[PDB]
Amino acid sequence: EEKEILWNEAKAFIAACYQELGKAAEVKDRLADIKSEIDLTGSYVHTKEELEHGAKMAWRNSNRCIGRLFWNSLNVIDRRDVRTKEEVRDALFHHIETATNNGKIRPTITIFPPEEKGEKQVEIWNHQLIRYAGYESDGERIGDPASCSLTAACEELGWRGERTDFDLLPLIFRMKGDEQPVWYELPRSLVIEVPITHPDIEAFSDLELKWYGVPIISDMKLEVGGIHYNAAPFNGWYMGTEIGARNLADEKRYDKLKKVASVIGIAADYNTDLWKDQALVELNKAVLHSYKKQGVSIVDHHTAASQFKRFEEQAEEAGRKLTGDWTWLIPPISPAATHIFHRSYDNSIVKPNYFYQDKPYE
Amino acid sequence: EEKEILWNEAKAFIAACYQELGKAAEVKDRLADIKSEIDLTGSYVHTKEELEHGAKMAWRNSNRCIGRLFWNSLNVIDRRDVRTKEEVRDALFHHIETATNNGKIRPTITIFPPEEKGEKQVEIWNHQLIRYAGYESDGERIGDPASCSLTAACEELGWRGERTDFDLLPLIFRMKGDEQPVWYELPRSLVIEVPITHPDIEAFSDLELKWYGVPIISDMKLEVGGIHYNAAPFNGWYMGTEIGARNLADEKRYDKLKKVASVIGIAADYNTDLWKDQALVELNKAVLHSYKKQGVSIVDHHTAASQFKRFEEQAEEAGRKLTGDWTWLIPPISPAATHIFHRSYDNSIVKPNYFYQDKPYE
Numbered sequence: 001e002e003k004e005i006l007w008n009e010a011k012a013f014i015a016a017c018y019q020e021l022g023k024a025a026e027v028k029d030r031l032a033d034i035k036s037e038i039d040l041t042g043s044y045v046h047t048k049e050e051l052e053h054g055a056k057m058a059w060r061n062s063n064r065c066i067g068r069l070f071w072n073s074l075n076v077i078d079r080r081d082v083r084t085k086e087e088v089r090d091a092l093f094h095h096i097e098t099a100t101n102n103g104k105i106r107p108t109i110t111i112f113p114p115e116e117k118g119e120k121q122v123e124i125w126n127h128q129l130i131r132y133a134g135y136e137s138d139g140e141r142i143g144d145p146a147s148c149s150l151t152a153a154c155e156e157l158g159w160r161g162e163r164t165d166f167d168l169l170p171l172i173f174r175m176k177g178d179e180q181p182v183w184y185e186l187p188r189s190l191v192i193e194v195p196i197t198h199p200d201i202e203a204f205s206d207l208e209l210k211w212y213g214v215p216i217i218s219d220m221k222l223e224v225g226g227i228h229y230n231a232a233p234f235n236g237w238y239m240g241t242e243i244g245a246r247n248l249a250d251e252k253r254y255d256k257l258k259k260v261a262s263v264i265g266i267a268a269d270y271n272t273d274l275w276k277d278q279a280l281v282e283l284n285k286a287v288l289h290s291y292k293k294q295g296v297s298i299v300d301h302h303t304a305a306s307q308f309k310r311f312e313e314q315a316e317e318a319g320r321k322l323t324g325d326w327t328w329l330i331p332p333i334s335p336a337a338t339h340i341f342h343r344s345y346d347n348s349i350v351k352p353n354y355f356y357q358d359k360p361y362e
Numbered sequence: 363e364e365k366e367i368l369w370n371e372a373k374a375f376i377a378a379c380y381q382e383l384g385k386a387a388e389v390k391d392r393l394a395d396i397k398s399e400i401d402l403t404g405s406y407v408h409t410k411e412e413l414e415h416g417a418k419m420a421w422r423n424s425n426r427c428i429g430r431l432f433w434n435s436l437n438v439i440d441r442r443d444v445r446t447k448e449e450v451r452d453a454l455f456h457h458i459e460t461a462t463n464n465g466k467i468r469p470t471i472t473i474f475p476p477e478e479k480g481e482k483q484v485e486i487w488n489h490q491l492i493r494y495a496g497y498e499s500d501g502e503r504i505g506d507p508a509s510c511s512l513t514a515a516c517e518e519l520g521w522r523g524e525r526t527d528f529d530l531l532p533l534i535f536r537m538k539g540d541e542q543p544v545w546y547e548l549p550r551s552l553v554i555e556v557p558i559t560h561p562d563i564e565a566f567s568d569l570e571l572k573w574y575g576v577p578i579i580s581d582m583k584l585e586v587g588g589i590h591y592n593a594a595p596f597n598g599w600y601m602g603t604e605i606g607a608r609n610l611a612d613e614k615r616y617d618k619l620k621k622v623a624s625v626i627g628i629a630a631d632y633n634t635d636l637w638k639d640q641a642l643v644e645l646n647k648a649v650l651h652s653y654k655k656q657g658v659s660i661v662d663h664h665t666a667a668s669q670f671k672r673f674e675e676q677a678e679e680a681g682r683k684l685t686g687d688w689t690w691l692i693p694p695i696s697p698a699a700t701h702i703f704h705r706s707y708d709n710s711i712v713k714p715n716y717f718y719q720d721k722p723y724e
């Protein structure tokens with residue numbers, strides 16, 4: 001069954017991929033080559049070109065992503081050659097540096113060797129390559145609660161955080177053949193952070209908020225033509241609301257709205273005053289202003305939705321069905337001010353695509 | 363087939379209804395009575411009690427409604443006795459007066475005779491009993507664009523609006539046996555309106571915005587045990603965002619955000635300034651403040667979502683499955699500040715319920 005699922009996915013992917021690359025004539029022999037290779041080895045190896053275009057198709061098919069307009073300019077780094085943990089570590093350091101690009105963020109994915117018998121070659125433990133630790137003992141919360149279980153897993157392995165609200169977690173990953181993962185402290189010189197200030201309200205700096213420049217998702221599996229690349233971290237630049245309306249605002253995250261309300265000089269006592277909505281807007285203005293001021297790439301939700309409209313139009317003119325998850329595409333502030341809110345989207349899953357996978361801790 | 367669909371829906375409704383009313387023992391004979399009545403007459407008549415509880419169940423099952431906590435206190439007016447257009451008109455006038463209740467709004471439904479062969483007895487043309495006219499000729503828009511087709515239909519029948527941005531449309535409905543509907547001007551003494559002012563910003567009154575107090579939906583069919591009440595207008599009180607984030611804000615409605623931005627003293631030039639979001643928040647604060655000041659019932663989206671949480675909890679403790687449409691339940695401003703955003707809902711349709719129907723114009 002496994003080999004048959006593989007062969008079928010291979011067939012579908014090579015046809016579509018080569019059609020898109022104007023290489024439709026080469027499909028026949030490539031398929032024959034693949035079929036033999038699966039018969040002999042139980043799997044098949046992608047060409048550099050197939051892998052790069054597959055990663056791009058995968059982004060293009062990501063129903064929950066509003067930023068898909070730029071799918072075709074994904075920078076794809078092929079690291080199927082890595083065999084040692086030092087090479088894995090160095091590749092992750094490199095991804096951070098080249099994606100950050102002194103603040104002019106390059107959307108990038110680094111692809112590591114794929115699973116074999118469902119057997120991972122490299123198993124990355126981080127949810128994002130750069131993320132803040134979280135702690136909770138005796139009712140006092142420190143840092144990012146979303147990171148508590150990973151943080152506890154790191155500390156069990158001998159890492160220790162300074163217990164600020166913004167401890168950078170170490171890179172942590174396991175190699176095939178090792179029972180324990182290894183971890184490495186992130187060099188601070190590699191990580192850009194932005195302090196949050198407000199364009200008009202001087203007191204906003206009193207909150208001492210900051211966030212990291214580059215979200216680099218490292219817990220999803222890239223699937224391309226039946227090959228499962230479980231370790232393939234990828235990044236874009238942030239949309240402001242991700243930081244302002246969620247990471248810093250959610251009660252189960254940094255929960256900053258009451259403190260924001262206070263520094264902007266409004267009461268946080270009456271639902272009818274819409275103080276949460278107002279705090280949310282000023283916090284989100286501050287996030288966008290701060291990233292721009294530091295020259296770190298970011299996009300606001302209005303501009304992002306306009307870009308996505310163009311993605312829709314581009315899909316139609318290429319004759320490709322559009323897929324999307326309306327529940328994720330609408331921004332969490334003023335959703336009805338975007339065109340997304342007022343239409344519907346087909347939530348069908350199309351491959352290549354990125355998929356969630358189980359984490360080893362948890 | 364029709365009689366069989368009817369009988370099946372009757373069976374399901376009477377069982378559930380009587381179970382809820384502690385009258386489970388009476389189900390057997392009531393059903394037998396109904397079965398005979400369908401055999402003879404092709405239909406059946408609800409008791410006062412069945413009709414009232416059915417209307418309430420229908421509200422309870424309305425997946426898109428965040429206000430369902432108060433389902434059991436719906437005020438049900440039984441007007442199955444009406445036969446003349448004067449009686450219809452007077453019943454609609456009465457609904458407006460009693461639902462308005464000098465601003466302390468009573469959630470109310472008036473139920474008119476139901477369809478027979480799919481043949482309506484009373485066909486109401488209004489989408490809401492109280493709504494503003496809309497005009498467009500030579501690129502200048504006046505009033506509410508959502509009302510353009512109905513407005514043109516009224517004027518074709520000899521009504522003429524003053525062409526302010528807030529002309530009250532007349533009541534317009536057709537009786538079985540008449541080819542043309544009739545219309546009646548709304549007595550202004552019956553219609554409460556609220557001028558929109560802002561709690562802090564004096565200049566807000568310069569926009570000369572207002573809205574009507576009571577939304578009374580009159581274009582949906584109430585279905586109860588296979589009986590189709592096509593004419594059964596119902597109302598609640600507004601949630602502020604309906605007025606502030608949609609009716610007054612949507613580009614295809616009153617489109618007021620640029621004017622709001624200007625009176626609140628912010629530029630409307632850069633997406634990154636989040637001027638639309640900020641204008642939306644101040645406009646929504648003004649709407650809530652204005653209704654409260656005038657003593658007209660209204661609810662903000664935070665309070666409304668808290669009430670809905672209780673509706674969920676009440677459903678679970680009664681052993682009733684909960685249904686909902688997440689896409690309508692989240693408010694259009696700060697949705698992620700409500701619990702609704704962070705859970706999912708089963709969108710199954712359960713009857714009794716309210717359903718959209720085709721309009722005669724359009």
Ligand code: HEM
Pocket residue numbers: 055058059062064065066067068070074107108109234235236237238239242299304328354
């Ligand atoms: C270039 C800038 C980018 C922006 C502004 C952007 C924006 C977003 C946003 C706002 C979300 C919703 C996230 C959430 O609410 O947690 C999202 C989800 C997603 N994006 Fe993008 N994105 C970008 C680039 C990329 C790239 C390069 C990829 C992959 C190659 C990608 C794949 C995805 C995926 C898979 C999700 C869903 C994640 C999940 O299920 O948790 N995006 N994106």
Ligand code: HEM
Pocket residue numbers: 417420421424426427428429430432436469470471596597598599600601604661666690716
């Ligand atoms: C008492 C105060 C009430 C509040 C605050 C309230 C709130 C709302 C809101 C915000 C919506 C979404 C509307 C939209 O976006 O256009 C809605 C939809 C709805 N409500 Fe309620 N509601 C209330 C009372 C009622 C009552 C009394 C009924 C019926 C007996 C009802 C039945 C519905 C229905 C059927 C919809 C869906 C309408 C559609 O599909 O267009 N509601 N409600």
Ligand SMILES: Cc1cc(N)nc(COC[C@H]2C[C@H](OCc3cc(C)cc(N)n3)CN2)c1
Pocket residue numbers: 215217234235236237238239242356
């Ligand atoms: C590449 C990228 C760019 C950008 N601007 N933003 C993102 C946001 O992705 C962040 C990730 C973190 C949470 O993951 C939650 C999650 C959990 C589970 C179990 C499944 C799933 N699909 N997603 C939500 N999306 C990713």
Ligand SMILES: Cc1cc(N)nc(COC[C@H]2C[C@H](OCc3cc(C)cc(N)n3)CN2)c1
Pocket residue numbers: 577579596597598599600601604718
């Ligand atoms: C009873 C009630 C109370 C309250 N606070 N708000 C409401 C809002 O209902 C207003 C109505 C007007 C639009 O109707 C649109 C519509 C169109 C169509 C074709 C189907 C459908 N279900 N709904 C959206 N909901 C109703």
Ligand SMILES: C[C@H](O)[C@H](O)[C@H]1CNc2nc(N)[nH]c(=O)c2N1
Pocket residue numbers: 326340341342343344689690691692
């Ligand atoms: C159907 C389409 O997604 C459309 O934008 C919906 C979305 N959610 C909504 N939610 C509410 N409350 N009211 C609406 O009119 C809509 N419109």
Ligand SMILES: C[C@H](O)[C@H](O)[C@H]1CNc2nc(N)[nH]c(=O)c2N1
Pocket residue numbers: 327328329330688702703704705706
């Ligand atoms: C799944 C559940 O509805 C949950 O609240 C979703 C809704 N929409 C979302 N949209 C985005 N962009 N990000 C999220 O994490 C979520 N969470």
Ligand SMILES: [Cl-]
Pocket residue numbers: 215242247
């Ligand atoms: Cl994030």
Ligand SMILES: [Cl-]
Pocket residue numbers: 577604609
């Ligand atoms: Cl309305």
